[PDB]
Amino acid sequence: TNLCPFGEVFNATRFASVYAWNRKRISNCVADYSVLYNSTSFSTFKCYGVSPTKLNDLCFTNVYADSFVIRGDEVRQIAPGQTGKIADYNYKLPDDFTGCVIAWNSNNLDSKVGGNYNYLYRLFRKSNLKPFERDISTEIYQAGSTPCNGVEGFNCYFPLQSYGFQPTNGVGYQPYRVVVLSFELLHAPATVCGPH
Amino acid sequence: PSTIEELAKTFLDKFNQEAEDLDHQRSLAAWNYNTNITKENTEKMNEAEAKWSAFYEEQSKLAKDYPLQEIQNFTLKRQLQALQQSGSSALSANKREQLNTILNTMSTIYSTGKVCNPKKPQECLLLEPGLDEIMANSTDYSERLWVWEGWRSEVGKQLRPLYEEYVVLKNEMARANNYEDYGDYWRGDYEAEGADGYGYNRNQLIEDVERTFAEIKPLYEHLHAYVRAKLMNTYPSYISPTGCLPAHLLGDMWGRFWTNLYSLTVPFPEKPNIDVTDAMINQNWNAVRIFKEAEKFFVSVGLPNMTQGFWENSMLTEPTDGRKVVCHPTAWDLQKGDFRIKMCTKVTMDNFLTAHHEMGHIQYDMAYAMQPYLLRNGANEGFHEAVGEIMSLSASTPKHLKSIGLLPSDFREDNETEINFLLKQALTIVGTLPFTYMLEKWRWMVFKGEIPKDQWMKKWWEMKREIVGVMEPVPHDETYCDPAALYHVSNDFSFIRYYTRTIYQFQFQEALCQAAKHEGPLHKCDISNSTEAGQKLLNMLRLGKSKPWTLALENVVGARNMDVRPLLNYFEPLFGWLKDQNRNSFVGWNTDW
Ligand SMILES: *[C@@H]1O[C@H](CO)[C@@H](O[C@@H]2O[C@H](CO)[C@@H](O[C@@H]3O[C@H](CO)[C@@H](O)[C@H](O)[C@@H]3O)[C@H](O)[C@H]2NC(C)=O)[C@H](O)[C@H]1NC(C)=O
Ligand SMILES: *[C@@H]1O[C@H](CO)[C@@H](O[C@@H]2O[C@H](CO)[C@@H](O)[C@H](O)[C@H]2NC(C)=O)[C@H](O)[C@H]1NC(C)=O
Ligand SMILES: *[C@@H]1O[C@H](CO)[C@@H](O)[C@H](O)[C@H]1NC(C)=O
Ligand SMILES: *[C@@H]1O[C@H](CO)[C@@H](O)[C@H](O)[C@H]1NC(C)=O
Ligand SMILES: *[C@@H]1O[C@H](CO)[C@@H](O)[C@H](O)[C@H]1NC(C)=O
Ligand SMILES: *[C@@H]1O[C@H](CO)[C@@H](O)[C@H](O)[C@H]1NC(C)=O
Ligand SMILES: [Zn+2]
């Protein structure tokens, strides 16, 4: 039929901040997963549940493309069964994840001298995220009894902080773009396939 | 609900963030200055220091609201203690208003100090570039004496009132921060708590310093005898074969390092000293190669290799673009995985060694980067420079020099150049130990109010004669403030680091050269290729300030406190030679002129 728009996702001009991670549905279409696992740009390419290359012969009822910008050392946090502020407060994958995690360094675009403080992350949260939950609150985190009168104060912190991406930073503190491909194996009709 | 410790953990989680972000911005500012001097960049560095200060003071107040006695995970307790134990600025804004200006006043005097040759009063010279040279290269008793007295007079007598006030205010700040005197406050840096017998009490530092210096005294005495005797041949009519040494006749403007008395004290002058500089020149080495060889050293023991940021962003060679630059070796941690080195490196053996020293710093920096911000530092003020020196000791051994390809493979270690080298070592390393111990003991006593101002200089020199074996060229009344004539004293810096640092390294070296199964004189070991050394060392470099410095030490050397035995060992060859050479001489100094 038609080819899947994986391009628009990976080669997208502007990328999202992890707390406001973006999700795109993969409609009836077929994509070449090889053009992905045949590119050397990718820093991290880990596939869970599935076999990387055999995907070009498989079919899936839905596919979801979540994308966000994170820190190098935080890419280890976007994997099934992980703790951390990213994996607990910004983007959690389910223990039975059946998809792939793709990520590359992006100092070239996301970092600027003086720093691109536009990408953000949730530092505090009253409870961990649920698999694929999203939280774009901006409410003062109340850590103690004293109520935060919608203002930052003692034991009262604003929950979202900004990555500072300066090109001189270290790989682990360098910007890395991440696309998580969620593959849905359901009894339903399978409209996302490869080389049949 | 949520305990004081839980709330405070969150509090620290937030500080760390705002701290590392704003430190990284300060750090980048200071880099842009030190590496490119412009009125603009100078301004911006000051601006960022302002924002940084504001942040730290506010956070320190907030930190004091989480009562330490309710925090119970010792790691967190250490972080909180560091954050809230900052109150040098915790009294009348008036006190901080001008009693910081006296501090500033002092530095300006020291920095603008000028003394004129009485024979050529028109020829007035500054310390930094015009007198330090005389005091290092001159053999004229009268010239050296006019420089020494001119400095201690023009500047010290001015700094005298200032220092007095400085003492009363600093003691007030200390008392305010629950410390007996500015002395107890400074000796805080050695205080530690945690586990069993891994804790350390500020009131032990004195003991251990004294105890260890007691054990160094023999060694020093003999070095003193030997230096005295040789000096008698240069300055006869001035040195008693049985008394103390005139303070102006030493290596520099103070008797801090006897390093520049080598030409006058060389053991066997005929034999030259290993100077690979010519080798490097002929082999067309450059700055990058020096640092690449350093990197190999650390890799061969199992430490990581330099980041790519390191190679891309470091100033490793004085700039030709015109930028004015501070040419002093520094090793930077700009708090985001950004590590760098600023060094106007030149192709010389010294620069080679110091490159290994500075990268030693970077390696420490890199190893503790896995720690929370407030724990990202050496176990105490001695550990960093101890680690750096370890590197430079291995790098310089004739063994290592051959493997690198800078010696001739068939090089011979005659027991004579070994003695020459060990002497030069002693002239810097051992010589400063007495000076350092005395200077801090004088300051500590003054802060404890055990030296009434009427007897300030009267004890200063009294102690100089008893401990350092040095006597004053001319007599000085209490109008003088000779101790303030040192950048560290008039610029408000702890000095005991320089002593403890020294005892710490040799412990380290004897521990890593013991893991490399090195056989023979410790002064001749190269930990190169020894991964067991690498691990022994790394397993403490990671700790940073996160465990009590006693524990870190034990993990490496196997002991919880200073032990001077490795130092003494490092010099034991020199020690025996010295004892013979002083057999038919008096060792010791009659305390009086
Ligand atoms: C630490 O380990 C390195 C690696 O072994 C040592 O450097 C190596 O030293 C040996 C001994 O001189 C060199 O062997 C020589 O090889 C050449 C041919 O490559 C040959 O013509 C000579 O007769 C000799 O057999 C070796 O090349 C050299 N480098 C490497 C990369 O192997 C080093 O000596 C060790 N110790 C220290 C303190 O660094
Ligand atoms: C310098 O470091 C790089 C990476 O930091 C090294 O490349 C690694 O080499 C080691 C040893 O062969 C491997 O374990 C890694 O898989 C390599 N790649 C990465 C991305 O880690 C390089 O070998 C090091 N070179 C030296 C001389 O130390
Ligand atoms: C993004 O573009 C590159 C080439 O520009 C291509 O190789 C890659 O497959 C693209 N990503 C997609 C199609 O998801
Ligand atoms: C040094 O700072 C000045 C500030 O006026 C700046 O214009 C110049 O570009 C800097 N030099 C560099 C970046 O090499
Ligand atoms: C202290 O807190 C840290 C929090 O991450 C934890 O790793 C550690 O186990 C706790 N306990 C001790 C004894 O350090
Ligand atoms: C002593 O002389 C050397 C050259 O012989 C010079 O470079 C140095 O600046 C002088 N002063 C010192 C070492 O304090
Ligand atoms: Zn250093």
Domain boundaries, chain A: 6-132+164-193
On whether residue B17 sits in a domain, the answer given is yes
- Please tell me the residue having the least CA distance from ligand 4 atom 8: B36
User: Which residues pair with residue B22 across a beta bridge?
Assistant: none
A102 CA distance to ligand 3 middle (Å) = 12
Test mutation, A140, A155, A160, chain B, max B CBs within 10 A: A155
Q: How many CA atoms lie within 13 A of B307 on its CB side?
A: 26
Q: Is residue B76 one of the residues assigned to a domain?
A: yes
Contact A17, A70 (CB under 8 A): no
DSSP letters for B253-299: SSSS-GGGGHHHH-SSTTS----THHHHHHTT--HHHHHHHHHHHHH
Exposed e or buried b per residue across A100-139, where buried means at least 16 C-beta atoms within 10 angstroms of its C-beta: bbbbbbbbeebbeeebbeebbbbbbbeeebeebeebeeee
Q: Which of A155, A161, A168 sits opposite B313 (nearest CB)?
A: A168
Cα B404 to ligand 1 centre (Å)? 9
Domain count, chain B: 1
Residue B31 inside a domain? The answer is yes
The finding on whether B136 has its CB within 6 A of some atom of ligand 6 is yes
Residues of B annotated as part of the active site: 358, 488
Tokens representing B324 are 């004015």
Among B314, B306, B350, CA closest to B332: B314
For A168, the closest of B13, B65, B309 (CB atoms) is B309
Question: Can you count the helices (H) and strands (E) in chain B?
Answer: 24, 6
Residue-by-residue DSSP string for B186-223: HGGGG-B--TTT--B-HHHHHHHHHHHHHHHHHHHHHH
CA contacts within 13 A on the Cβ side of B387: 30
**φ, ψ for residue A44, nearest 5 deg:** -130, 125
Ligand 2 site, residue B98, Cβ cutoff 6 A? no
The token duo for A5 is 């728009």
Separation in Å, CA of B313 to nearest CA in chain A: 7
Cβ pair B1:A157 closer than 8 A: no
Q: How far is CA B226 from CA B263, B573, B578, in A?
A: 14, 15, 7
The residue in chain B having the minimum alpha-carbon distance to the alpha carbon of residue A71 is: B336
Gap from CA of B454 to ligand 1 centroid (Å): 66
Q: CB under 8 Å to B367, separation ≥6 — which residues? A: B303, B538, B541, B542, B544
From B421, B7, B306, B339, select the one nearest A153 (Cα to Cα). B7
Q: Is B336 close to A124, i.e. CB distance below 8 A?
A: no
Is B475 a domain residue? Answer: no
Query: DSSP letters of B42-90?
Result: HHHHHHHHHHHHHHHHHHHHHHTTS-GGG--SHHHHHHHHHHHS--SS-
Positive or negative, the CA dihedral B48, B53, B54, B55 is positive
- Ligand 6, atom 2: nearest CA belongs to which residue? B137
Chain centroid to Cα B178, Å, comes to 27
Does residue B464 form part of some domain?
no
Integer Cα distance of B452 and B464 in angstroms: 17
* Cα B369 from Cα B538, distance rounded (Å): 12
Under a CB-based contact definition with an 8 Å cutoff, are residues A124 and A141 in contact? yes
The answer to whether the Cβ–Cβ distance between B338 and A168 falls below 8 Å is yes
Q: Which atom of ligand 2 is nearest to the CA of B296?
A: 27
The residues, ordered by sequence, that sit 6+ positions from B359 with a Cβ below 8 Å of its Cβ are B291, B294, B295, B298, B306, B331, B341, B391
**Residue carrying structure tokens 């804790």:** B199
CA B88 to chain centre: 22
**DSSP string computed for B317-340:** S--SSS-----S-EEEE-SSS-EE
Note down the domain range covering B42.
1-86
DSSP-based three-state secondary structure for B145: helix
Name the pairing type of β-strands A175-184 and A156-157.
unpaired
Residue B33 included in any domain:
yes
For residue B66, being part of any structural domain is answered with: yes
One-letter identity of residue A151: V
Contact status of A157 with chain B (Cβ, < 8 Å): yes
Q: How many CB pairs under 8 A join A and B?
A: 57
DSSP characters for A110-128? H--TT--TT-EEE---SSP
Residue set of the binding site of B for chloride: 190, 497
Multiple choice CATH, A6-132+164-193, 3.40.718.10, 3.30.70.1840, 3.20.20.140, 3.50.30.10: 3.30.70.1840
The residue whose CA is least distant from atom 20 of ligand 2 is: A43
Please give the helix or strand (H or E) that residue B524 lies within, else none: none
Q: In this structure, what DSSP letter does residue A56 have? A: G
